[PDB]
Each structure stands twice: as C-alpha cells, then as structure tokens.
Ligand SMILES: Cc1cc2nc3c(=O)[nH]c(=O)nc-3n(C[C@H](O)[C@H](O)[C@H](O)COP(=O)(O)O)c2cc1C
Ligand SMILES: Cc1cc2nc3c(=O)[nH]c(=O)nc-3n(C[C@H](O)[C@H](O)[C@H](O)COP(=O)(O)O)c2cc1C
C-alpha cells in the first residue's frame with residue numbers, strides 16, 4: 099500500500115525551499131503527532147514550533163551550524179514534558195515533583211515524544227514534504243532551554259526540520275534484517291554477527307564509493323565508531339538531573 | 347490523505363483473533379521499522395520477534411497478566427541496543443564501553459527504538475492490523491532479559507502486540523492542541539493552563555460517562571494523579587545501570 103511505500107521511501111532532507119508550511123499543514127502535523135500511542139495516557143511531551151528568525155538561527159548555531167534548521171518550512175522542537183503533570187497536580191493542591199524524577203518517567207517521556215515525532219515525520223512525508231531530525235540541539239541544552247524558555251521538568255530532545263525539498267537526495271541502506279530482527283531470543287552467535295557486519299560494511303563502503311565517485315570508501319563500523327568518540331555530550335549525565343529527570 | 351487518515355484513526359487493540367502474521371507481513375513490518383531515521387546512522391536497537399508460546403505466556407505474566415501479549419498475530423520486543431556497537435569496537439581494538447554507559451547514548455538508543463516501533467505501528471495499521479504497545483514488560487526487566495536471553499548493553503523497552511483485531515474498540519481524545527503545541531517559547535501562562543486543563547478534564551469525564559454509562563466519571567487530572575501515586579518502578583534506576591546503560 100501507499101503508506102508502507104512512503105515509510106520505505108524515507109531519506110533525510112537537508113535542502114529545502116523558502117516556502118513556509120501553512121497553518122493547516124502545521125495543524126495536521128501536530129494532530130498526527132498527538133495521535134500516537136502514549137504510556138498510561140500521560141502524553142508526556144510538548145512540541146515547540148519555531149518560526150522566529152533569531153531563535154531558528156540560534157538553534158542552528160547550537161546544533162553545530164546546520165543551515166536546514168533556519169532554512170525550512172517550519173522548525174519543531176520535541177520535548178520530554180512532565181511540567182504539565184507537575185502543574186496539573188498543583189491545581190489540585192498536590193506537589194508531586196519527586197514522583198516525576200525517576201528513570202522510569204524519563205523513559206516514558208522520551209518514548210512518548212519520539213512516537214509523536216515519528217507520526218509527524220510520516221504525516222509530513224505522505225504530503226510530499228521532507229524532514230530531518232536534529233539531535234544536534236543536545237550539544238548545548240542549557241542554551242536551548244534559554245532560547246525556548248522551557249521550565250523545569252521540560253527537556254528538549256531534538257528538533258524536526260520540515261519543508262518542501264529543494265533536493266531529494268537518496269536512500270541510505272539499513273542493517274541486514276538478521277542483524278536487527280531476532281527470533282525468540284537475542285542472537286549472540288559470533289559467526290552470525292561477523293558475517294552480517296562484514297556484509298553491511300561492504301554495502302556501506304560500496305554505497306559511499308558510488309555516491310562520492312570514489313572520493314569516500316569508509317565502512318559503517320569505522321564511521322559509527324569515529325563519530326561516537328567525538329562530542330560525547332557527557333554533561334547530559336548531570337544536566338538531565340538538573341532539569342528534573344532520571345534522578346537517583 | 348490515506349496515511350494521515352490511518353494515523354488519526356489509531357486506537358490500541360487489545361483483542362486479536364488467533365490468526366498469526368505471515369513471514370511476508372513480519373518482513374514488511376521489520377523493513378518499515380528499520381526505515382525510520384536514526385541518530386548518526388547508529389541504528390541503536392534490536393527487535394525480538396516472540397512466537398514461542400511459552401515465552402509469549404511468560405512475557406504476558408511479567409507484563410502484569412496482559413492476555414493480548416500471548417493472544418496476537420506476533421509479539422515484537424523493542425530493545426535499546428549498544429551491544430552491536432560494543433562488539434564492533436572490540437573486534438577493532440577500540441574501547442567505547444564507558445561512552446555507551448552515558449545518558450546521551452541511553453537517549454540515542456531509546457529514541458532510535460521508539461521511531462522504529464512507531465513506523466512498524468503505522469505500517470501494521472495501514473494493513474488493517476491492530477497494535478498495542480506493552481510497557482508492562484518493564485515491571486520485571488531482570489526476568490524479561492532471561493526470557494529473551496539479551497546480552498549486556500541490550501535493554502528491552504516495550505513489546506508491540508500486532509494482529510487481526512477481534513474488537514475495534516474506540517478512539518481516546520488527546521489533549522487540546524494548545525496544551526501540547528507552543529509557538530517559539532513554552533507557554534507557562536497559568537490562566538491558559540487552567541482553561542485548557544478544565545476543557546480537557548470535562549472532555550475526558552464526559553468520555554468515560556458515555557463509554558461506561560455513568561459508572562466511571564474520572565477526569566484526566568484524577569487519572570494522572572492516581573497514575574503518579576501508583577507503585578513506582580524505582581528499581582529501574584539501578585537495574586538499567588546493571589545492563590550497562592545510564593551508569594553515568
Ligand atoms: C510505550 C508504551 C507502552 C504502553 N504499555 C501498555 C501496556 O503495557 N498495556 C496496555 O494495555 N497499553 C499500553 N500502552 C497503550 C496506552 O495505554 C495507550 O496508547 C493510551 O491509553 C492511549 O490510548 P490509544 O492508544 O488507544 O489512543 C502503551 C503505550 C505506549 C506508547
Ligand atoms: C534523533 C535523531 C537525531 C538526528 N540528528 C541529526 C542532526 O542533528 N543533523 C542531521 O543532519 N541529521 C540528523 N539525523 C538524521 C540521521 O543522520 C539520519 O536519519 C541517518 O543518517 C540515516 O539517514 P536517512 O534518514 O537519510 O535514512 C538525526 C536522526 C535522528 C533519529
């Protein structure tokens with residue numbers, strides 16, 4: 099069907115026209131996001147739509163100079179949100195902050211926000227729009243919270259750049275099915291692991307050779323390890339706790 | 347748009363027929379899940395397809411006796427996976443074990459797994475199948491990791507029950523748009539908060555009154571307050587660290 103074709107056709111779009119999203123398109127994207135399943139009906143997230151040129155610019159800089167954060171149809175910031183729940187309880191004369199600060203609630207809010215974001219992404223892609231997630235905002239969350247004026251119990255997780263593509267780019271191959279999908283138990287067989295990872299590394303190296311006309315030939319395992327041990331964002335261990343999450 | 351109609355039509359399905367998913371349907375669902383965006387191309391997740399009757403039964407018990415975990419077309423378990431990355435590093439003489447233990451990588455893997463799960467959910471719903479996320483497996487993760495034989499740096503997050511619906515249930519109203527969506531900065535205005543929460547509380551109380559015919563009239567505030575005061579899964583603060591996540 100058309101939905102599965104749209105899902106499988108996905109690629110990140112990093113080049114957009116200057117055509118802004120309409121209020122109707124933004125409305126549809128937000129409603130689509132909200133329609134996602136939510137743990138215990140908590141809906142533990144918020145979406146900040148950034149259209150202010152100065153704020154889009156600041157976020158682009160904080161994200162590591164990503165121009166598709168400024169130049170797009172709209173920039174959405176997905177947040178883990180337990181502030182709604184804190185304030186909801188204060189209205190009833192209750193002061194429940196300690197209950198919102200454990201690892202369980204941090205997992206709940208991150209998963210809720212991510213399911214909503216992926217619904218927005220599929221909805222945007224079905225309309226012929228392009229998307230790109232922006233985790234780069236996590237380089238400087240203290241400054242991002244100042245740009246967005248987010249209160250305590252609110253954690254920006256990533257942005258989502260949405261717009262009319264100026265360049266369609268191309269699809270990136272995913273891990274072989276047998277690396278990701280396991281039947282009944284997790285497959286720890288070393289021979290199986292080496293065979294799948296060798297095959298994938300060759301697929302990726304060939305992909306870069308083809309895409310760059312021989313200019314790049316890196317494997318997936320070399321690429322992922324190179325970037326993992328770079329800007330590790332260790333400050334988040336304490337910073338998330340400062341915002342009221344994942345404590346103890 | 348058909349995709350958007352499917353997204354907006356979502357409701358959790360908790361009653362399935364005994365018709366199992368075909369190998370082709372499972373293949374399509376897995377490929378759909380893999381097609382989601384992934385932070386730095388890391389694909390930090392694994393999907394365990396549980397078809398073994400004894401394992402589906404154990405997981406339904408561990409999830410708090412949820413029969414739709416056992417009786418469905420297939421039961422998928424979504425895991426945060428940094429074991430793939432640890433093993434790739436080991437086979438190259440690199441050491442990233444400490445970085446895979448930080449908050450940043452825990453967020454990366456939780457988000458990657460959730461985006462994949464929501465792609466699978468939309469793909470399943472577009473085929474006329476029903477889905478239900480199962481976070482209940484987090485009640486006893488030590489026993490869940492034994493059922494699934496997951497190694498270190500692998501964390502089961504939630505299950506996803508997929509199948510042919512035996513009962514279509516009904517939609518649950520979501521928060522008003524103004525409660526979740528903010529323009530440029532987070533809206534902390536108390537009057538705005540009270541007005542939106544009062545409106546939602548009435549929508550929800552009216553919803554339950556119609557759904558149960560006057561026998562249930564709780565507001566969304568009542569329901570969140572009672573959820574918050576529940577038996578907390580506090581053990582996860584230490585348990586996730588035991589699996590090599592969020593050690594910090
Ligand atoms: C991560 C996650 C975990 C969930 N875990 C469970 C569960 O264990 N049992 C269950 O019956 N529903 C579960 N749900 C379903 C939610 O209860 C449901 O999405 C919420 O009540 C909104 O209802 P709706 O999906 O029908 O719109 C979960 C949803 C999410 C997103
Ligand atoms: C949570 C998240 C954060 C991301 N952050 C960024 C980012 O800051 N900049 C960027 O250019 N791409 C970003 N991406 C896009 C990934 O790089 C991209 O999804 C991966 O390379 C696979 O490529 P594809 O999306 O084109 O299939 C992110 C993706 C996710 C899921």
Ligand SMILES: [Cl-]
Nearest residue numbers: 232233234385
């Ligand atoms: Cl990132």
Ligand SMILES: [Cl-]
Nearest residue numbers: 137480481482
């Ligand atoms: Cl749950």
